[PDB]
Each structure stands twice: as C-alpha cells, then as structure tokens.
Amino acid sequence: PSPEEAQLWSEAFDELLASKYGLAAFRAFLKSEFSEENIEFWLACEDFKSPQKLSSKARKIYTDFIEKEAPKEINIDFQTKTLIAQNATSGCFTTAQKRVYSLMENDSYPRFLKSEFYQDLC
Amino acid sequence: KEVKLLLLGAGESGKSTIVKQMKIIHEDGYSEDECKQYKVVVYSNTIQSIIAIIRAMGRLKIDFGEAARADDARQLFVLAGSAEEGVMTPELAGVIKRLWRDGGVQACFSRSREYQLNDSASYYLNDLDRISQSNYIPTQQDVLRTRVKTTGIVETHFTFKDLYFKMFDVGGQRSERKKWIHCFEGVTAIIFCVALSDYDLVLAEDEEMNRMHESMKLFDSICNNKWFTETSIILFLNKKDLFEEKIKRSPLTICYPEYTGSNTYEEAAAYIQCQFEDLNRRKDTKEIYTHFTCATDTKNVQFVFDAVTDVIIKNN
Numbered sequence: 075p076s077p078e079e080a081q082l083w084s085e086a087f088d089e090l091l092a093s094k095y096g097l098a099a100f101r102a103f104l105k106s107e108f109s110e111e112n113i114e115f116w117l118a119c120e121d122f123k124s125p126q127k128l129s130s131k132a133r134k135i136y137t138d139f140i141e142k143e144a145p146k147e148i149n150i151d152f153q154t155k156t157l158i159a160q161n162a163t164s165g166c167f168t169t170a171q172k173r174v175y176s177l178m179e180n181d182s183y184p185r186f187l188k189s190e191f192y193q194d195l196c
Numbered sequence: 197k198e199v200k201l202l203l204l205g206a207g208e209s210g211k212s213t214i215v216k217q218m219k220i221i222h223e224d225g226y227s228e229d230e231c232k233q234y235k236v237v238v239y240s241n242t243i244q245s246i247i248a249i250i251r252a253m254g255r256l257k258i259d260f261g262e263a264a265r266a267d268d269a270r271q272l273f274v275l276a277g278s279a280e281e282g283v284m285t286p287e288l289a290g291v292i293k294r295l296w297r298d299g300g301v302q303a304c305f306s307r308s309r310e311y312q313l314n315d316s317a318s319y320y321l322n323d324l325d326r327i328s329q330s331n332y333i334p335t336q337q338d339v340l341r342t343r344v345k346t347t348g349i350v351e352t353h354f355t356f357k358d359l360y361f362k363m364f365d366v367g368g369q370r371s372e373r374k375k376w377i378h379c380f381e382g383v384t385a386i387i388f389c390v391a392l393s394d395y396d397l398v399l400a401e402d403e404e405m406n407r408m409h410e411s412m413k414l415f416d417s418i419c420n421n422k423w424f425t426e427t428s429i430i431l432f433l434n435k436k437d438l439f440e441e442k443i444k445r446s447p448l449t450i451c452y453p454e455y456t457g458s459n460t461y462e463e464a465a466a467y468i469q470c471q472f473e474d475l476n477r478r479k480d481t482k483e484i485y486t487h488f489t490c491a492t493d494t495k496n497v498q499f500v501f502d503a504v505t506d507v508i509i510k511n512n
C-alpha cells in the first residue's frame with residue numbers, strides 16, 4: 075500500500091500487475107467475481123514466456139486452461155483455441171495471453187478501480 | 197422484501213446491456229466522466245469491427261472496389277498497432293472512412309454472418325465523423341452500444357417500487373457456465389436473454405454450432421431445471437431491431453429448415469417464440485413471461501422491466 079503506489083494503478087493496468095501487493099489485491103477481486111482463472115493463466119504465461127520443460131509446462135497449462143470443460147477454462151474464441159492447440163515453443167501462448175490480458179483490462183479491471191477495497195487503499 | 201434477479205443467456209445475448217439500462221433507469225444515468233471512460237472502448241470496438249471485415253475478405257474471396265484501398269487496408273493494421281488509447285488520429289479516421297465506403301468492403305460487411313462481427317459495427321462505423329473528433333465524449337447510446345465481454349459473475353444493487361433488487365450478471369460463453377451454480381440459491385426471477393438476430397450466426401466458441409440452437413438448448417436446460425421451480429422465468433427475445441432488419445435479407449430457414457412462413461418481423465418473431473416456449477415441459481404448471489426487447493433502447497427496457505416487476509410483485 076502507500077497510497078502513492080496504490081493510486082498509480084488506475085493510470086494503467088501494467089502498474090497493478092507489476093506490483094506485489096497490487097497483483098494480490100486484484101487476484102482477490104477476480105476471485106470475488108469468479109474470474110480468477112484469467113490472472114492465473116496470464117501468470118502462467120509469463121513463467122512460460124528448457125524445451126523439455128517448455129514441452130512439459132505446455133501440456134499442464136492446456137489441461138488446466140484450454141481443454142473443453144477444463145477446471146480453469148479461460149474465455150477465448152475458437153480461432154484462438156485451435157491455433158493454440160495445433161501450435162513446445164516460447165511464443166506459443168502469446169495470442170491467448172493477449173486475449174486474456176484484454177479480458178481483464180476491459181471488464182474486470184475497471185470494476186476493481188471502483189471497489190471500496192481499492193477506494194479505501196487510495 | 198429483497199429480490200434476487202439473475203440475468204442468463206448465451207454469449208453476446210444482451211445481459212450486460214440490460215444491466216446498464218438499470219443504471220440509466222434507476223440510478224440517474226452515466227456521468228460525463230463515466231462516458232469519457234468508454235471513449236477507449238468505442239474506438240477499440242470501431243477499429244476491431246472494420247478489421248474483422250477486412251480479415252474476412254481474403255477468406256471469403258472478396259476484392260476491393262478500388263485497388264487503392266489495399267494501401268488503406270494495410271495502413272489500418274499499421275496504425276491500429278500505433279494509434280492507441282484514447283485518440284483516433286485523422287489519418288486513421290480517413291483510412292477507416294475510405295475502407296467503409298468501399299463496395300468490396302460493403303459486400304463483405306453484408307456477408308458478416310460468415311464470420312464474427314460486432315453487432316455495433318455499422319452503428320459506430322456509420323457515425324465515424326462524430327466519434328473521431330478529438331473532443332468526442334460518448335453518449336449514453338454509444339455506451340450502451342459498446343461491446344465488452346463479461347467474464348465471471350458481477351453483482352449489482354438497485355431499488356425500484358420499494359424493492360431491493362440484487363442483480364447478477366454472468367458470462368454467457370460455454371466456458372463460463374460452470375460458474376453459474378454460484379448464484380442459483382434463492383433466485384426470485386431469471387431474465388433469460390435470446391438475441392433474436394443470432395438465427396443465422398454461429399458461436400464464436402464453436403463455429404459448427406448455430407447460435408440460435410445453442411440458445412434454445414441452453415434455455416431448455418434452465419427452464420426445466422428443477423431448482424428454479426419456484427422461480428420466475430422471464431424470456432427476453434432481445435435485439436428485435438437488428439432482427440427486424442435481418443429478416444428481410446437473411447431467411448429464417450437458415451435456422452429452422454422446416455419453417456414455411458414468411459420472412460416478416462411478426463411471423464418470424466412469433467415462430468421463434470414458439471420454439472423456446474415449446475421447450476417448457478411443465479406447461480401445465482410453469483408460466484414463461486416472454487417479452488420482445490431492444491436492450492439498447494432505454495424507453496423499451498424501462499417499459500418491459502416495469503412489467504417484469506409487476507409480475508414479481510403479484511407472484512410474491
């Protein structure tokens with residue numbers, strides 16, 4: 075908190091995700107809106123972005139986030155899901171990461187800024 | 197007493213727009229600042245819309261009216277990458293304008309059912325001169341028209357005719373529907389949304405599934421679900437306006453191959469209503485309160501909700 079640091083997050087979304095306490099506040103909020111799989115997927119995409127570990131991590135991520143009826147199935151379209159499924163490479167999830175990033179930025183993130191949990195901190 | 201209102205339906209059906217209309221009708225509207233915040237969304241919506249059309253042209257084998265648009269088409273993507281929030285430069289505005297007036301692009305626009313195009317594309321694109329101004333503040337209609345995908349579950353609180361309305365807005369995509377169980381307990385009324393105009397479109401998440409059938413199968417699932425027995429099932433057959441425009445051009449037989457009726461508003465709309473209303477199995481016991489709505493029209497939503505409320509008041 076600060077709120078110097080806190081206040082700063084409403085200017086741009088990269089600030090929030092960049093800071094430790096802020097990222098925790100937002101994950102808390104997404105958990106409260108049952109959309110937490112997004113922040114998780116993005117957090118996974120960064121740890122993703124060895125090739126035996128690149129191969130490894132990819133399958134784990136797929137089962138968790140992309141397979142049909144998956145436990146943490148993220149909300150992307152079919153054109154993105156397939157090119158994801160077809161294409162153990164570094165830039166693999168780039169498109170999916172960007173979509174989920176936008177999903178959080180456009181929908182959840184504004185509401186986070188208007189919550190009292192952030193309005194108090196600030 | 198308290199009312200637990202649940203807004204359900206397939207993706208892009210109009211749930212979140214109805215939620216905005218509750219803000220407009222029951223909470224003194226959107227402030228100017230609130231509108232300014234949608235400027236970036238209106239530009240994004242506009243830019244993606246034209247991009248969608250361009251992308252489709254190759255796939256569908258459609259050529260520009262004038263070969264000079266190829267420059268503009270490529271220039272669109274260059275400037276989409278640079279021209280970022282919250283300003284559309286004059287150069288981009290001109291590119292989008294030219295592309296939009298082009299006959300090949302228009303041809304492709306007319307075949308939008310073959311790909312995924314925002315409903316509000318032509319609303320924004322036909323209004324480019326106004327929105328492209330640097331001093332531009334979006335209007336409430338502009339806000340209501342914006343497209344932002346709902347993910348998760350979002351709860352709103354408002355008051356009307358001495359009733360504490362707890363409203364729940366959910367995401368409609370297949371991936372989201374697992375989550376719906378988190379707000380099924382103690383539901384007074386469900387407003388199920390069906391985008392009438394989706395009869396010739398296919399799901400963004402599965403392009404082999406006709407949207408209208410997805411909506412039908414979903415409603416059947418909800419309607420007859422034994423945990424909403426003591427629960428008002430209101431059906432909003434939404435997007436009547438886009439539908440009124442669509443039915444003259446695109447035949448309903450794309451959706452319902454058996455339909456021998458005309459392609460006029462009231463006959464088609466009546467047919468669709470039956471297809472949903474017939475899925476109700478407790479016909480003897482359970483009543484479905486259907487309404488033809490235009491979610492983006494405040495006067496309409498206000499009228500329909502006023503009605504909806506009275507149902508609940510009598511039924512509780």
Ligand SMILES: Nc1nc2c(ncn2[C@@H]2O[C@H](COP(=O)(O)OP(=O)(O)O)[C@@H](O)[C@H]2O)c(=O)[nH]1
Binds near residue numbers: 213344436489
């Ligand atoms: N013309 C028209 N557009 C609508 C109507 N209802 C919704 N829309 C638009 O359709 C898009 C999807 O609406 P939205 O509420 O976000 O869908 P949701 O996923 O069910 O919440 C938005 O761009 C809305 O502005 C309608 O009745 N008429």
Ligand code: ALF
Binds near residue numbers: 345346366
């Ligand atoms: F069902 Al949605 F945005 F697609 F609420």
Ligand SMILES: [Mg+2]
Binds near residue numbers: 211346366367368
């Ligand atoms: Mg929505």
